[PDB]
């Protein structure tokens, strides 16, 4: 049977998660519901070694009125992606609040080894690369990638997070 992974995309609203996922995911199967019920539901096929993996992508809206529903959004998640804008300092500072709220609401098995990936979106930047890696290294060595909406490292970031989910 084909492997299925539930992947949560977290980040502050307006960071650029929608435009970024548009380049990656299969648009033909997307379901756009961020403003209504709090998430876009995306999907994409990922190759990890010989195995072909189908990813179920939950791109959360991040708006305040959906916070209580985080228990249902994150339930059963296999891995989580943390997104920030390198020019928006507030989006970087929120990465610690999103990760902690994810661990509390999702309450996953093996929390210290749960797969995470941090993504920095590029477009003069405020957050340095080393300051982002120090936070990633601080949280158990989270893989860090930088990309632009114009692809790039997004494909590698998801092959890494998919590989770490299959190890568990």
């Amino acid at each position: 049977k084909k492997v299925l992974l539930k992947v949560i995309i977290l980040g502050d609203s307006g960071v650029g998660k929608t435009s970024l996922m548009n380049q990656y995911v299969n648009k033909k199967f997307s379901a756009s519901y961020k403003a209504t019920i709090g998430a876009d539901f995306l999907t994409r096929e990922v190759m990890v070694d010989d195995r072909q993996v189908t990813m179920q992508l939950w791109d959360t809206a991040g708006q305040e009125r959906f916070q209580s529903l985080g228990v249902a959004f994150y339930r059963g998640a296999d891995c989580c992606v943390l997104v920030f804008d390198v020019n928006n300092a507030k989006s970087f500072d929120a990465l610690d609040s999103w990760r902690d709220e994810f661990l509390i609401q999702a309450s996953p098995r093996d929390p210290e080894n749960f797969p995470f990936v941090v993504l920095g979106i590029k477009i003069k930047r405020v957050i340095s690369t080393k300051r982002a890696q120090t936070f990633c290294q601080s949280k158990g060595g989270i893989p860090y990638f930088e990309t632009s909406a114009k692809a790039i490292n997004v494909e590698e970031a998801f092959q890494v997070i998919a590989r770490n989910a299959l190890m568990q």
């Binding site: 519901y33 403003a35 209504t36 709090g38 708006q63 009125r65």
Partner: protein, 166 residues
């Protein structure tokens, strides 16, 4: 035993608020059982959630129904009615069922098709005394006056509207 009553009613138009900063502008009228007798952040979030969920269910079901919107929702504790009274303008009404010790019943409650006809007649009645349409009124007298006009009418109608058969 608590008899069935009107839980909440909303009139919204998605075209009036297409960005997240202006989402609450979609709502031109909102009444709860408590309001029929100062809106907090939690209450505002809840209204946006009720109206967003209705739109999401509409968007979802249109894929299977050849574009037809959701018109009736059946929950354990409420009977929910959704009617597009004119192009773009929606009435969402949630009727709390009869609470008996609790256990919930819809035997006394009007059928969904009847509640819908009541809301349409009230809509027809409101226009008869004010203008041609909600869209025409919005342009002629503006948002503030239309909302004030809708609040006077619907508050009085919802106070007397009987959701039971008799």
């Amino acid at each position: 035993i608590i008899p069935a009553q009107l839980g909440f009613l909303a009139i919204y138009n998605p075209a009036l608020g297409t960005t997240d900063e202006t989402l609450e502008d979609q709502i031109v009228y909102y009444a709860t059982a408590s309001t029929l007798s100062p809106v907090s952040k939690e209450e505002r979030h809840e209204r946006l959630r009720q109206i967003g969920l209705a739109q999401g269910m509409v968007e979802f079901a249109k894929s299977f129904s050849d574009g037809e919107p959701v018109d009736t929702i059946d929950t354990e504790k409420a009977r929910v009615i959704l009617v597009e009274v004119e192009e773009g303008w929606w009435i969402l009404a949630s009727i709390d069922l009869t609470r008996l010790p609790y256990e919930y019943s819809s035997r006394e409650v009007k059928p969904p098709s009847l509640l819908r006809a009541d809301l349409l007649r009230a809509y027809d009645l409101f226009l008869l005394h004010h203008g041609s349409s909600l869209s025409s009124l919005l342009a002629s007298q503006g948002r503030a006056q239309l909302v004030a006009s809708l609040t006077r009418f619907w508050d009085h109608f919802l106070a007397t509207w009987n959701v039971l058969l008799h």
